[PDB]
Amino acid sequence: MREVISIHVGQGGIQVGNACWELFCLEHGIQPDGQMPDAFNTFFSETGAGKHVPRAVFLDLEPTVIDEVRTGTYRQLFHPEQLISGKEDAANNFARGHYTIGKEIVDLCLDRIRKLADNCTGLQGFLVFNSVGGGTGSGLGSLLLERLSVDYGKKSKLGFTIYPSPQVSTAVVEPYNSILSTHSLLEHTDVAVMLDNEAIYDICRRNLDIERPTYTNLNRLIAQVISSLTASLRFDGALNVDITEFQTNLVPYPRIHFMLSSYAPIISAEKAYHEQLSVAEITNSAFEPANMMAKCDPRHGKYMACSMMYRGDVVPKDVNASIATIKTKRTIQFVDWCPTGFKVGINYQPPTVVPGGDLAKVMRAVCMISNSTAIAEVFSRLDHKFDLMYAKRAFVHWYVGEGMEEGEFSEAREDLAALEKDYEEVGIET
Amino acid sequence: KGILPMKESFKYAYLVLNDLFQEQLQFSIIEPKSATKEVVKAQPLIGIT
Ligand SMILES: Nc1nc2c(ncn2[C@@H]2O[C@H](COP(=O)(O)OP(=O)(O)OP(=O)(O)O)[C@@H](O)[C@H]2O)c(=O)[nH]1
Ligand SMILES: [Mg+2]
Structure with a gap:
């Protein structure tokens, strides 16, 4: 009678969701077809006779990854109409996925969330996965969190965001939308966990002794961390911990939860x-x-x-x-x-x-x-990267022309300055 | 600074000698002294954001 719903948005989110969903199915003995050849109830639901359906929803505006999912070995597992897909990608533009194309898709996602929530009776909370340095991921994650915070209220939401590395980067414009998304989830998410790729690359190189890793190796480690976090809800233990028993133990103040x-x-x-x-x-x-x-x-x-x-x-x-x-x-x-x-x-x-x-x-x-x-x-270095290009207003025209106002960039900067001042104020001894 | 306790006659003789060396040898027998001037310059208030 204890349940949790995981939300996967963006390419990185879907690719780590695949990684965690092989692991859960393997850990509970469920075959890829969904058929077994009372602990499953946390992540799954019984259909009455036979297969199990994950309590997960996949979101993306760009259809390639979802189409890859719907043709692999796991085509029979997920419900056909919870893999919401768009037509046009946001193309790393945050304003697109928050103001232009994400709004027309967010209603279907919220309807799916309601249809999944009415089934659960002991809903512990939500999980969400999103790579921050992308348009659709950050924008849709922000919009979904903002809608959920008012639709449900006090239910707990956990965010496994992947911030960009200090120096290694794949895009050139990811500081802008990273800062904006941090602004959005600062006042809207109860827990945020840091997941940048460079540290995990070093971990793989030093311990696993792999000199040419790919994204799957990273996602498997993340999946193992998720399984370790949520094991206490579905297995017997001498000293149990629940999700709701976190903000009372790890979060000294409402602002500080990274x-x-x-x-x-x-x-x-x-x-x-x-x-x-x-x-x-x-x-x-x-x-x-x-x-x-x-x-x-x-x-x-x-x-x-x-x-x-x-x-x-x-x-x-x-x-x-x-x-x-x-x-x-x-x-x-x-x-x-x-x-x-x-x-x-x-x-x-x-x-x-x-x-x-x-x-x-x-x-x-x-x-x-x-x-x-x-x-x-990490906040200080992201802020320094942001300021360099915001001094000359570079790449701003790609955001102003997608409905966002000019002043929206400044207030995110002010909130980051406030957060950095708060972190300094807390760390001084009495 | 007027710190050299010198008779004016020797001060003039030394200046004439210096001018002679500066014209003939392109060298000064007077050691150059630094003059510091405070100058007020404008800098933009670039917001350190
Ligand atoms: N850890 C990890 N990070 C990823 C993976 N795939 C992409 N990323 C990160 O995601 C960032 C860009 O966002 P993406 O997830 O690739 O794309 P998106 O979130 O769908 O946003 P769009 O570009 O609009 O489609 C990159 O900087 C990568 O670091 C992955 O498989 N594992
Ligand atoms: Mg994409």
Whole structure:
């Protein structure tokens, strides 16, 4: 009687949704056709006899990815008319997907959301995935969040956004729409998790020893993180954690809800079994700055609160004996007004392996969600990138001619300045 | 600055000697002193946004 609905918008969102939906189907024993040859109820729904239907909706204005989905092996799984598709792409223009073509599509998506919500009885909250540096992704994510915040109100929404890397970039105009989308979801999303690609590339290179990774390898790690986060809702555990038990433990103030994640262990089968993978060493590896899932240095800032999930055969006393060691270290310092900052969850189900993938099978794993003061650097560098081109009003004509006003750029800049001032104000000791 | 405790007669003799060296040898026997002038320049208030 506990449910959650995941929203996938944009090319990156759909490509990570595919990645998480192989993993969930594999973890619950459901074949790609949707047929089994009481834990499924969190992500799926029973049709009365036979197949299961995911509680997910796919959105995009550009039809190529959806058409690829509707012809692959998973054509029989998803309901045919929840893969909403458009005709014309926003083409990396934020104003397009927020004012011009997204408005005519958003009504169908909201109707689908209502039709899925009326089925659930214990709706925990929503999940949303969107790559920020694109037109349709950021614009439609902003519009959907704004509609949901007023249609439903206090229901919790979680956002797994992928911000651009510090120096590596695929587009040339992504700072503009990244800043605008951050403006939009700052006052509209309860949790936002950092996911830039460069850090995960470094993780793959160093640990998985892959020298030529593709997007699928990144999306599989993201899917594993999602599964670790939501395992506690569908498996028995000695110390459970619910989604609604987050803003009471990781969010000191309503404005501050951007945090960065990490995962451990990450190791290949060729050298995994030569070492014992004790809980102490994995919880040490999880706190290593080089294993952050976002390219930010935690040594440059304080910690505010750490929520970290275990799964497997871990014993609570071993967890406490390792939290003490971390509190001992002099290179990791917490904020003054937080004496204890750890929330611990323990689950029994070990992580599942996907055949043909990178990760091996292990009995212990740890996933941490940590809120730290050091996150302000990404905001500062994105702001610096934005200012350089906004000084000469470059690329603005592509946005003014799509219905957006001239002054809309300035207030996003002011909100980022306010956020950066707030992060500095919080981190000073009393 | 008038800090050199020199008789005026020697001050004139030294200036005449300096002018002679500057005309004949293109060199000054007087050491150049720095004069700092405060100048007020306009800068745009480029908003550091
Ligand atoms: N992690 C990850 N990021 C991706 C992936 N695909 C695209 N991105 C990121 O998404 C950004 C651009 O947005 P996209 O998702 O590609 O395109 P979009 O969101 O659909 O927006 P449009 O261009 O209007 O179609 C790029 O800067 C990429 O970094 C992916 O498969 N995995
Ligand atoms: Mg696209």
